[PDB]
Amino acid sequence: AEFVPPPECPVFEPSWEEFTDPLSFIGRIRPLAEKTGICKIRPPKDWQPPFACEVKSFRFTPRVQRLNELEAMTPREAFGFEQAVREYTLQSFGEMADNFKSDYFNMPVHMVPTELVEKEFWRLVSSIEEDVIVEYGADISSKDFGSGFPVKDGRRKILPEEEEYALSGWNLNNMPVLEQSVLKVPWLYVGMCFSSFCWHIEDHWSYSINYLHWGEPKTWYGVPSHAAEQLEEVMRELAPELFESQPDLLHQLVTIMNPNVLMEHGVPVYRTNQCAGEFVVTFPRAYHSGFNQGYNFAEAVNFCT
Ligand SMILES: Cc1[nH]c2c(C#N)cnn2c(=O)c1C(C)C
């Protein structure tokens, strides 16, 4: 009855030579990675961009997430009122997040095995006897708060040691984002234990790339694009009737589904733990979902080839 972890997605460890151009590298690994939907890329050991967000002034109001909101829908008094959220700094959010996780598991946050957090996450999502509520930061533009990468924009100070990172093609501010036609900037994610995102693809079936600047790992699940329609059919068969008819862009706001359910219906699913300093790439029309193991900070952008 415990969750069965999907097989691991490919992890690549490029040489310095392979690491010069991200689009060339992604094009070369595509024959394998597009068959798994997601892959993980570990930069060379010495590639360590400094964290460039203005942490002192970094303030944000997280949103609240109830893990079992869908299963709970199987009329509670005064529904719609979450209590409420307050404004945090990055530091005070992290204090809240660590206290939550260490209290939840009764152990220091870094001693909780990633497989236990995963098993407990999926138990909680389906449990009606236990309502767990977490908070996270998303819908956070790097244009308002600053990028996690140094940028030669004249707004902060680049040190000489930072300049190579401001100019690197793996700096997500330097990824190509313009689609060709006859006719964006990176976003930031502040996670805590159990905060999660449900199954979705990107607009225009775009690639996406995500960098975990620091913190505890981010656990991902990915489905290759060749199984996109099978995943959509399982969702339709098993989603609530009230939401079955909804357009994809709205339905993707509530498409939470245990990976084992998809696997039981023949949908291939792969997993990974993205750790600090690692990239995850999602391929075009590769459904993905995931959750955070603890307090962390990621940056992501949709790019075009
Ligand atoms: C909403 C959301 N989406 C994503 C993606 C994607 N795609 C990757 N990480 N990630 C997140 O951590 C969050 C929240 C929980 C902080």
Ligand SMILES: [Mn+2]
């Ligand atoms: Mn995504």
